[PDB]
């Protein structure tokens, strides 16, 4: 996102795991999805950050996946993070 990386800032001081859940509308135009049908209208994406484990593990409708699946889903939703048009930060 064009900014400094601080994973520990997100994690609550004392708590092992910090969790974000985001729900989006689903349409039958995106492939490589777990547990979710094309006719389904719900995409639940969860990100957890923990101190002990150092890996990229996300959740799709509460199912553990590598970051590659969620990344290609983001690509197939025509939304981009590196590109500065879709996302605007201080830098």
């Amino acid at each position: 996102i064009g900014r400094s990386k601080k994973v520990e800032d997100f994690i609550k001081n004392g708590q092992d795991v910090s969790k974000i859940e985001i729900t989006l509308k689903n349409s039958p135009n995106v492939t490589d999805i777990e547990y979710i049908d094309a006719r389904d209208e719900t995409i639940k994406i969860t990100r957890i950050i923990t101190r002990s484990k150092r890996r990229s593990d996300y959740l799709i409708n509460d199912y553990q996946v590598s970051e590659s699946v969620v990344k290609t889903l983001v690509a197939q939703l025509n939304i981009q993070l590196d590109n500065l048009c879709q996302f605007l930060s201080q830098e």
């Binding site: 879709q86 996302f87 930060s89």
Partner: peptide
């Protein structure tokens, strides 16, 4: 201006 043409569901702006 370059939002309706784009197929991105939404745009994010920070420190605006």
């Amino acid at each position: 201006a370059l939002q309706e043409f784009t197929s991105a569901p939404f745009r994010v702006v920070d420190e605006i």
